[PDB]
Amino acid sequence: MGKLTTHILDLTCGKPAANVKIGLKRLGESIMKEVYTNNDGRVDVPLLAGEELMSGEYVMEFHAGDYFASKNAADQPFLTIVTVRFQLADPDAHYHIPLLLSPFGYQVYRGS
Amino acid sequence: MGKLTTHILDLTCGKPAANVKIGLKRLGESIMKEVYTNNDGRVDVPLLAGEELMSGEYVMEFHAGDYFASKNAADQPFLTIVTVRFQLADPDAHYHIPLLLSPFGYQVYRGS
Amino acid sequence: MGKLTTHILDLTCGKPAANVKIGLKRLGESIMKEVYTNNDGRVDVPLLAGEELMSGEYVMEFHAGDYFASKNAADQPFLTIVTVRFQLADPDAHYHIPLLLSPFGYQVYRGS
Amino acid sequence: MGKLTTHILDLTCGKPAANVKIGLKRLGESIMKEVYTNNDGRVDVPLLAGEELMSGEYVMEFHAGDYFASKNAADQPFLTIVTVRFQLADPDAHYHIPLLLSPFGYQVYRGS
Ligand SMILES: O=c1[nH]c(=O)c2nn[nH]c2[nH]1
Numbered sequence: 001m002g003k004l005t006t007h008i009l010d011l012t013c014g015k016p017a018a019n020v021k022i023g024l025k026r027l028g029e030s031i032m033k034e035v036y037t038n039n040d041g042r043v044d045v046p047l048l049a050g051e052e053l054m055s056g057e058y059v060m061e062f063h064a065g066d067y068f069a070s071k072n073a074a075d076q077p078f079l080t081i082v083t084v085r086f087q088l089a090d091p092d093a094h095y096h097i098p099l100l101l102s103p104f105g106y107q108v109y110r111g112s
Numbered sequence: 113m114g115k116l117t118t119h120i121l122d123l124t125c126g127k128p129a130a131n132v133k134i135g136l137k138r139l140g141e142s143i144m145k146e147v148y149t150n151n152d153g154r155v156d157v158p159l160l161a162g163e164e165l166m167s168g169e170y171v172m173e174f175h176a177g178d179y180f181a182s183k184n185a186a187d188q189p190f191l192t193i194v195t196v197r198f199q200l201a202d203p204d205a206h207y208h209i210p211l212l213l214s215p216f217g218y219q220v221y222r223g224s
Numbered sequence: 225m226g227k228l229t230t231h232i233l234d235l236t237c238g239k240p241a242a243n244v245k246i247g248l249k250r251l252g253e254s255i256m257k258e259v260y261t262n263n264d265g266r267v268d269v270p271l272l273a274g275e276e277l278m279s280g281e282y283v284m285e286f287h288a289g290d291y292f293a294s295k296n297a298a299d300q301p302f303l304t305i306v307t308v309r310f311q312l313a314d315p316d317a318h319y320h321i322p323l324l325l326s327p328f329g330y331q332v333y334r335g336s
Numbered sequence: 337m338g339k340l341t342t343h344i345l346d347l348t349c350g351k352p353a354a355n356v357k358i359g360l361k362r363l364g365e366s367i368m369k370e371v372y373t374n375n376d377g378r379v380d381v382p383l384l385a386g387e388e389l390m391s392g393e394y395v396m397e398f399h400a401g402d403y404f405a406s407k408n409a410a411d412q413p414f415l416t417i418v419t420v421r422f423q424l425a426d427p428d429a430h431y432h433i434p435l436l437l438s439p440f441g442y443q444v445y446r447g448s
């Protein structure tokens with residue numbers, strides 16, 4: 001009964017990044033899920049839980065380019081799809097990986 | 113005559129991350145280069161320059177897992193290969209993308 | 225009925241920083257509060273709320289040095305007291321300012 | 337013959353933060369220096385060197401509020417003066433402490 005959640009903050013305006021598409025995939029495979037953050041910059045249902053959450057490597061494709069585009073970065077943005085690889089060791093643990101995001105930089109961390 | 117350089121700092125000990133392997137690839141392709149940072153956590157020759165640097169999307173595969181492993185994170189580390197996608201718009205510009213790295217989090221930015 | 229909360233994550237081990245002392249003070253004054261984070265790296269009661277929360281500048285003194293010391297950085301640590309100044313404009317708003325912390329670097333942000 | 341340098345990057349536009357005032361002071365004292373970053377977001381002469389650099393705690397007052405103000409955050413900005421405390425142990429070592437800055441968050445690290 002593990003769990004994988006996330007969270008996006010736009011450091012340009014201190015608000016949660018809303019309606020950003022997030023791709024989810026197992027390492028070496030194709031997208032398996034596609035979600036859009038709510039107003040809190042989170043997703044209602046965990047990105048992964050129970051059976052689903054299998055120990056291994058995953059990748060999340062945060063669509064930063066489109067998000068900043070709507071809030072305005074340019075025709076060929078520096079950040080298009082912020083990609084995040086990570087390995088989930090224990091299948092019964094909680095993994096909260098937020099994303100602090102800016103047009104030209106970002107923080108990826110295992111928060112609480 | 114554009115240029116792509118990078119830099120790795122281990123925020124766990126304030127020192128540059130040395131001898132870390134860095135994979136380089138164009139979006140959707142296979143590795144095209146493989147380098148190992150020196151003692152300053154940089155690479156002698158630009159990761160990309162002149163002809164090579166074509167406008168588009170690239171990906172750098174920082175091998176964080178192995179680096180921390182040598183400095184010690186575990187059998188199934190949270191971070192294995194920190195992956196970084198980005199788009200290089202102008203082919204004649206300088207792009208310096210450093211990496212602030214920690215066992216459980218990291219910063220990716222367009223520095224100077 | 226505004227609110228000021230915070231949160232500390234130790235990026236060295238992906239866990240919340242527990243029992244870290246946090247000083248709170250208005251700009252130019254002496255400490256007014258002193259708290260110790262719980263196991264979630266948070267404090268049970270808001271650091272500021274209602275009447276208390278007056279528009280202006282505050283400072284939080286995160287005692288990183290002692291925290292890392294207990295988990296081990298040295299005799300004269302790089303980070304001793306991570307100091308964070310910020311201005312609270314609206315008195316009725318919620319301000320969540322977490323702290324991503326490492327022996328040699330840290331992130332300060334207005335999260336959700 | 338130690339050295340203290342710094343560097344400011346505006347993560348909102350990937351450029352160095354130019355002409356930002358930086359206050360320098362020893363712990364518990366008044367400003368001792370006041371500098372303004374050049375176009376590279378650095379200062380020509382080290383903020384501290386040789387004799388000057390004495391082992392102990394210092395504080396740098398990055399004037400983020402004014403900088404973003406000129407580039408535009410509001411009347412009562414979240415960040416006014418980003419304050420950074422740190423301890424310099426060895427007097428003969430090089431300490432490079434850059435600042436990744438955004439209207440609502442920032443990274444402080446011991447870079448190379
Ligand atoms: O949902 C979250 N809550 C928090 O308090 C937090 N702190 N960092 N990341 C976080 N994510």
Ligand SMILES: O=c1[nH]c(=O)c2nn[nH]c2[nH]1
Binds near residue numbers: 224
């Ligand atoms: O090579 C670099 N030099 C610097 O001064 C710097 N600051 N941030 N990233 C950087 N990379």
